[PDB]
């Protein structure tokens, strides 16, 4: 059963095993069961850890339900794949990726006075091809002041760095004037409309190029896994795979009583139903209850 904080996370979720846990919970509440009071407890560090591990139970069956657009031509399979992961972010409680990674910046650098310590605590989230181009330009503005460039904004020594880092950001290809004019806004709704149409033209060309770089790495991983496997004789392949299949079954049979190992071996019985339901009618496929 679910712990009533999982089932609040699975309401806007749309995978199968989470909706049938919701639907049997809503069928219990139709038969007069009391909805248990959700906890007004679990302080700021424990609340961010439950949100970390309940979002990952919405993301994990959702990622396995998104077909990769491997070996497709065009942007719309890559835009479908990116839109399904956007919607998986919203179903799991994430915001927009722009609003969720900039929250990661301002959280990791809450205590930063100099921008060299910004550029070292946001190292995991910024590309090293871009972290280096902001560190080389930093040491030139460090050469003009011969004092550490501050994370102040009011400082004029930062204002000449922010005009040099804007020259770096346009060199990568990303419009730093359009990005800044979106998250700041404007007064009228007509001049803010044209900059949102120009941010979302960058943003869609941004997240497509992250999805397409993810597809081009799965395509390159699968093509090197296959070409290594096609160089084996077929007798080696069948026993390398039967050794890997049997070792991975035994790890789920060593684990007794665990919920994951009970569900692992129950899905092995559901794959063998799929192979057996196809053998009865192969022009029809698997037989669904209809």
């Amino acid at each position: 059963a679910v712990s009533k904080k999982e089932v609040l996370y699975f309401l806007s979720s749309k995978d199968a095993e989470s909706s049938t846990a919701v639907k049997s919970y809503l069928k219990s509440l139709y038969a007069g069961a009391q909805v248990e009071a959700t906890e007004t407890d679990a302080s700021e560090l424990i609340a961010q850890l439950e949100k970390k591990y309940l979002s990952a139970q919405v993301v994990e069956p959702g990622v396995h339900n998104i077909a990769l657009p491997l070996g497709e031509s065009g942007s719309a399979p890559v835009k479908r794949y990116a839109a399904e992961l956007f919607n998986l972010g919203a179903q799991a409680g994430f915001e927009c990726p722009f609003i969720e990674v900039s929250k990661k910046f301002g959280q990791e650098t809450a205590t930063s006075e100099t921008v060299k310590d910004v550029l070292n605590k946001t190292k995991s989230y910024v590309s090293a091809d871009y972290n280096a181009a902001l560190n080389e330009v930093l040491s030139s503005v460090e050469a003009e002041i011969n004092g550490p460039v501050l994370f102040d904004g009011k400082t004029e020594g930062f204002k000449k760095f922010a005009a040099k880092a804007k020259a770096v950001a346009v060199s990568r290809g990303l419009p730093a004037d359009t990005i800044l004019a979106y998250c700041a806004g404007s007064a009228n709704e007509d001049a803010a409309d044209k900059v949102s149409k120009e941010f979302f033209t960058w943003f869609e060309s941004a997240y497509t190029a992250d999805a397409a770089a993810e597809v081009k790495a799965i395509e390159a991983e699968a093509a090197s896994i296959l070409d290594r496997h096609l160089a084996k004789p077929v007798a080696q392949i069948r026993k390398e795979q039967a050794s890997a299949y049997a070792s991975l079954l035994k790890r789920a049979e060593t684990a007794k009583g665990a919920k994951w190992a009970e569900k692992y071996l129950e899905d092995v019985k559901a794959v063998q139903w799929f192979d057996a339901s196809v053998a009865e009618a192969p022009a029809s496929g698997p037989k669904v209850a209809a």
Binding site: S12, K27, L29, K79, N87, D190, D193
Partner: protein, 441 residues
């Protein structure tokens, strides 16, 4: 010589062969909506399997397909969102009546394609006399539900809806598009509310204009609500909820209209209670409260818990700038009720987080004896997207349900709250808002 299941088997053998082209998969889909084939899901699945496999696409077969997907009510996100590839490639090739069908179908399915709706709005704002007003509401329904807040189109649509009087189905699509954008421009809504006096042939657009008014909180216009009390058998139980929720939010008291609408949804929940979303079971409890019309004893107690469920789920998945606003408003609520120092505001805002009677959690809930006051912060996602920026109709939905639980909901909107410069001005804004609702505090 009149065979429906023998023509389904000949459509099934048309899309089960190996090289089905675009025109044959388009016309198999068109034939499945005119035949109304909701019962056979696998035959609809064989069509959308070949609809993704089809590589040719001219302007005619793409719009016949996307019409059939949208009209038939068939949802598959992977197939439809990859049909936006043909659409951006065929976009100058499309007629203005054809461009209205693809954007209404790709928008209504939720396809996040900013390159499509940017170029498909640019041909409406450039060639606006070329588009019939029914075709402007289709593009407006598409760009709104595709996640684009394109107000350059929403202004150019309103110039047409005041110049030409539109159909009732045309207006209710335009109201539904403006309700999701959250615009509530009374210069455009009232130009569309005069289309609902010639009668409405569908209940699905009388229910949708009902939802779109209450989401902007205008009011019920007396010819929508009496169109809804006679044709509330044409509506699905997920559609009759959003009719009654939209009438309750606009302030309708025609309780026999609510007898008609609740006569659909109550036997549907009694057959399968898990048939509706928990977001729609909560929109029933708002509608069963503000109009006050009752439900069965097994239903109205069940949807009362599903307001407690659907309000917690929106609190766990809080926008983190709403979490920054609630903990800011609760701090000003601690200063307003007397707390000069930080160990007093930190120990007071932890005491404001009492539990609601339905099981949910209220964030700023103050109790003095027999009177309770709830403070509500409504950030920007629940605000109207225009310049006066009143809060949307869903904030009075949450208020009047809590007011029927014993609370006196004081609304603190963030367009007014965060324009204030310091914590003392923010505390007197919160204190004045509590005095306006329950002056005992």
């Amino acid at each position: 010589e009149n065979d429906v299941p023998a023509i389904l088997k000949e459509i099934d053998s048309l899309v089960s062969r190996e090289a089905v082209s675009a025109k044959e998969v388009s016309d198999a889909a068109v034939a499945l909506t005119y035949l109304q084939v909701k019962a056979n899901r696998r035959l609809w699945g064989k069509v959308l399997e070949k609809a993704g496999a089809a590589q040719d696409y001219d302007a005619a077969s793409l719009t016949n397909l996307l019409w059939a997907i949208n009209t038939g009510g068939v949802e598959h996100f992977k197939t439809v969102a990859e049909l936006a590839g043909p659409a951006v490639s065929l976009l100058p090739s499309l007629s203005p009546v054809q461009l209205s069908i693809v954007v209404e179908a790709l928008g209504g399915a939720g396809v996040k394609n900013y390159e499509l709706y940017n170029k498909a709005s640019a041909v409406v704002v450039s060639k606006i006399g070329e588009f019939k007003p029914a075709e402007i509401a289709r593009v407006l329904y598409g760009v709104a539900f595709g996640g684009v807040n394109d107000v350059a189109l929403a202004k150019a649509a309103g110039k047409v809806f005041a110049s030409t009087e539109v159909d009732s189905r045309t207006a209710a699509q335009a109201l539904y598009a403006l309700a999701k954008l959250g615009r509530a421009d009374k210069a455009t809504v009232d130009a569309l509310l005069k289309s609902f006096k010639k009668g409405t042939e569908s209940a699905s657009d009388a229910a949708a204009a009902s939802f779109a008014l209450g989401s902007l909180s205008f009011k019920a216009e007396k010819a929508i609500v009496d169109a809804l009390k006679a044709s509330a058998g044409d509506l699905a139980p997920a559609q009759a909820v959003e009719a009654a929720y939209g009438l309750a939010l606009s302030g309708a008291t025609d309780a026999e209209a609510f007898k008609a609408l609740f006569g659909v949804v109550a036997p549907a929940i009694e057959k399968a209670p898990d048939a509706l979303e928990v977001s729609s079971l909560a929109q029933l409890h708002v509608a069963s409260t503000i109009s006050g019309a009752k439900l069965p004893a097994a239903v109205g107690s069940f949807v009362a818990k599903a307001f407690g469920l659907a309000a917690d789920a929106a609190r766990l998945k809080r926008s983190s700038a709403e979490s920054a606003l609630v903990a800011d408003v609760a701090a000003a609520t601690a200063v307003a009720f007397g707390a000069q120092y930080r160990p007093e505001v930190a120990s007071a805002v932890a005491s404001y987080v009492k539990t609601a009677p339905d099981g949910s959690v209220l964030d700023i809930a103050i109790t003095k004896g027999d009177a309770k006051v709830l403070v509500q912060a409504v950030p920007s996602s629940l605000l109207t997207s225009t310049t006066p920026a009143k809060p949307l109709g869903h904030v009075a939905a949450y208020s009047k349900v809590r007011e029927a639980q014993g609370y006196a909901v004081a609304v603190v909107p963030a367009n007014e709250f965060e324009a204030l410069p310091d914590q003392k001005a923010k505390a007197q804004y919160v204190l004045a808002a509590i005095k306006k609702v329950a002056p005992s505090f």
